[PDB]
């Protein structure tokens, strides 16, 4: 039928960035008309693809990844970036082909007194490879003494809360992000405009 973009975009819940959600889009026609011609997006940037041309193309599969970050971090959802999000939460490859879409969701995802449901990974020994998803909750060992599952000095829970409050500045407000990857394989195409 029609590719179920609404299930992704108009979803009541969104994932924390460290456990970002991925929907696989196959065997349907995708019209990007609603997305490119909606005035409700803070960010709509495409790489290796032009948005108008999207309805004139065909891919093996499309991937829709979804999560929440803060505004100042949306710039890290792009090829070749660095920072806590790009390094330890969600990493785009340098040859990325697809589009990043983001919109302010302060009305949905912020709570007076702090919304502590949305998390980000703060500690990680090494960088993420592109499209890697790390859901570990092992205690982070910042020294040479083993932590053994208990928090303490040099032994920290690797995930931290954003604590979105509606009073935050726009750079610290939650933004919902959808990353569309258009994958080109040597196989029959199943997603078209």
């Amino acid at each position, epitope marked *: 039928n029609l590719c179920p973009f609404g299930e992704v975009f108009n979803a009541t819940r969104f994932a924390s960035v460290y456990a970002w959600n991925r929907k696989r889009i196959s065997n349907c026609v995708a019209d990007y008309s609603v997305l490119y011609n909606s005035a409700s997006f803070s960010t709509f940037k495409c790489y290796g693809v032009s948005p108008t041309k999207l309805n004139d193309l065909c891919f093996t599969n499309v991937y829709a990844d979804s999560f929440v970050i803060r505004g*100042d971090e949306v710039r890290q959802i792009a090829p070749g970036q660095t920072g806590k999000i790009a390094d330890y939460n969600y990493k785009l490859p340098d040859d990325f082909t697809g589009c990043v879409i983001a919109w302010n969701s302060n009305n949905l995802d912020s709570k007076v007194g702090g919304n502590y449901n949305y998390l980000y990974r703060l500690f990680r020994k*090494s960088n993420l490879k592109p499209f890697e998803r790390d859901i570990s909750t092992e205690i982070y060992q910042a020294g040479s003494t083993p932590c053994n599952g208990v928090e303490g000095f040099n032994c920290y829970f690797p995930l931290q809360s954003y604590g979105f409050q509606p009073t935050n500045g726009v750079g610290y407000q939650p933004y919902r992000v959808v990353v569309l990857s258009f994958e080109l394989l040597h196989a029959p195409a199943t997603v078209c405009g």
Partner: antibody
Amino acid sequence: QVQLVETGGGLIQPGGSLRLSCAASGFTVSSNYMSWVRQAPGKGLEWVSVIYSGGSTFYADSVKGRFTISRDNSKNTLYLQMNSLRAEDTAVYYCARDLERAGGMDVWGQGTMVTVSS
Amino acid sequence: EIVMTQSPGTLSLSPGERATLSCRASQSVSSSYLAWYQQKPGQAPRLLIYGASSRATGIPDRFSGSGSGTDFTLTISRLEPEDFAVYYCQQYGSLYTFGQGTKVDIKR
């Protein structure tokens, strides 16, 4: 047990070069957010540079293209390579460990003095 | 560039009085990313408060912190002779910037 000790400070001329070292004990440099913060005589604290556990580095605008932060995991040591020094780089340079929301900058060295003069 | 401005520049109090230091960020920042540090002459800074109100290890109970949005406050409930020093606020949510500092004076 927890100690940061800075070395390498001294007197140098404008346009000169110097490499500061910060030896750590009680935690692993490569496992942490490690920063240099400087304080000019009589003024406040100015962050200089940071290196993430994963290798990413960031710099203050006032040192971009002149300073480079790095580390040696074998000697558990952080380094600041400073090129094209100017008179305003004259300051005490501290090396510090940051925990962000998990506890701020909780460990500081005692600093090393760098004087840049003609 | 987030600019932190502290007030007042100098605070003059006696041992046993209450100290109230204010810090204003030029842009709204989460209380998650606010810290307070103490510095005495010739010594490195020492972390007092992280995450706007969490005391660091070893920090006595007279030190408290609060605030949100652009305004934050460090409070020393009853001042000890050790408490006469300079105090800096810091945001660490977008790299790091400090305030110019507030000095606590011995009043007379």
